[PDB]
Amino acid sequence: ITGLVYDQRMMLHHNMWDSHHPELPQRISRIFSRHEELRLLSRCHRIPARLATEEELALCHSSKHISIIKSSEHMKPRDLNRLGDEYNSIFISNESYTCALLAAGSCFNSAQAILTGQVRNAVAIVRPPGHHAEKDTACGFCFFNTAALTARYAQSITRESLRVLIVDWDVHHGNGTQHIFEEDDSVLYISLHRYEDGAFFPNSEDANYDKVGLGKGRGYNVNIPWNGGKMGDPEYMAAFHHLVMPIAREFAPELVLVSAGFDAARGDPLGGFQVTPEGYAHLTHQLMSLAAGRVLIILEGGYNLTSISESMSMCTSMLLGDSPPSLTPLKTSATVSINNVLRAHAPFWSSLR
Ligand SMILES: CN1C(=O)N2Cc3c(c4cc(OCCN5CCOCC5)ccc4n3Cc3ccc(C(=O)NO)cc3)[C@@](C)(C2)C1=O
Ligand SMILES: [K+]
Ligand SMILES: [K+]
Ligand SMILES: [Zn+2]
């Protein structure tokens, strides 16, 4: 059984100054309508959304950050603009805090459904996204770190050191997720992302391959940075083959969360990559071999409405047990990237030797 969570109320978060801003309310309604069209929706167990509580938010966020975001609820447009502008790439409306709570609470109910054994795996069609949000700050369309929160939520109902793998295949680095877990050996963070030697958002060397984790978390942060323009299925499949899956198997996660942005998709105007719906299906299918199939796919970014609809629906079809669809040599710089990661992580993972 595959679970699915979607709630129309998460459409209420909007940019009142620019209704064409790419992080659109209709990102989630289009993905949901596509699951209906492909007859995937009726094959899933529907999990209800709920609000995250402030206590749950404190699993990862400071009380000052929660408080500041919550206060936005009762702001006039001018102050919404001023507050959003204190962050990098944030717009806020009166509904934003509520929607951020719903995105987190939806993922919690999904992780609970998996861990109580109501469902084997699940998909969360949620917004606003999460992975740029830091303990103390909002960033990059993200208010609270939904995936990071979900990992802590899962630990709070099982065991504190429950081994959680987060695979972040959004085209951007999840700086917030990396930082939250940087000293933590219970949460393995693996990100693939466009880097371009720092020219690609969020423009920090924190995304480079030599950032391997700190203290007891050393070896538990795996950055796979792409340089040198468009990448697609071959490069993604090669990174999963050489790096993601051997490290993951060695870690032996008890729960997999996917920070599943679909902005590395063919057609995305922000990502500039060419990962196909069939590619994402193969990535999902591989991750399903981990943690006895306990996989929660969480929407992050992805801005071409058709691309994200087809791609996320393909992932759900895999979680449901459908056969992987049918699938070149790698761009030279992709080989260089993979080999850099391998060199950086060989000291920590015997499977890479
Ligand atoms: C690549 N790239 C970027 O990532 N940098 C951040 C950025 C960019 C950008 C451009 C935008 O409008 C361009 C005009 N047109 C839009 C329609 O298409 C045609 C162009 C709007 C928001 C923007 N943001 C903010 C942002 C974007 C994605 C995530 C996300 O998914 N992370 O997981 C997080 C934050 C920039 C300039 C820089 C940028 O170009
Ligand atoms: K990523
Ligand atoms: K970590
Ligand atoms: Zn992104």
This entry's atomic model was obtained through X-ray
**Residue 30 contacts residue 308 (beta carbons within 8 Å):** yes
Best of 131, 194, 201 to mutate for ligand 1, by most ligand atoms within 8 A of CB?
201
**Residue 309 contacts residue 351 (beta carbons within 8 Å):** no
Ligand 1: which atom is nearest the Cα of residue 174?
Answer: 33
Ligand 1 atom 20, closest CA: 269
Cα dihedral value 282, 342, 211, 137, nearest 10: 0
Distance (angstroms) between ligand 4 centre and the Cα of 265 equals: 11
Q: Considering Cα of 199, then 204, then 209, then 210, what sign does the dihedral take?
A: positive
Using alpha carbons only, give the angle 337, 235, 89 rounded to the nearest 5 degrees.
75
How far is residue 92's CA from residue 79's CA, in Å, rounded to a whole number? 9
Cβ–ligand 1 distance for 140 under 6 Å, the answer yes
Strand 187-194 and strand 221-226: the pairing is parallel
Q: Is 132 a catalytic residue?
A: yes
Residue 305's SS3 state is helix
**Residue 107, CB-side half-sphere exposure with 13 Å CA sphere:** 39
How far is residue 98's CA from residue 96's CA, in Å, rounded to a whole number? 5
Ligand 1 atom 4, closest CA: 201
| Listed residue (115, 37, 25) closest to 316, CA to CA | 37
- Provide the CA 66 distance to its chain's centre, in angstroms: 21
CA distances from 259 to 39, 43, 96, 252 (A): 24, 23, 20, 18
Ligand 1: which atom is nearest the Cα of residue 263?
Answer: 31
**Residue 249 contacts residue 290 (beta carbons within 8 Å):** yes
**Candidates 131, 132, 282, 285; catalytic one:** 132
Domains and CATH numbers, the chain: 1-353 (3.40.800.20)
Q: Is the peptide bond before 22 cis (omega within 30 degrees of 0)?
A: no
Distance (angstroms) between ligand 3 centre and the Cα of 135 equals: 15
* Ordered alpha helix ranges (H), the chain: 26-37, 54-57, 63-71, 77-84, 96-115, 146-156, 175-180, 233-239, 245-251, 277-287, 305-319, 332-345
How far is residue 64's CA from residue 290's CA, in Å, rounded to a whole number? 37
Which amino acids are annotated as binding site, given as ranges? 168, 170, 172, 177, 181, 187, 192, 211, 259, 263, 345
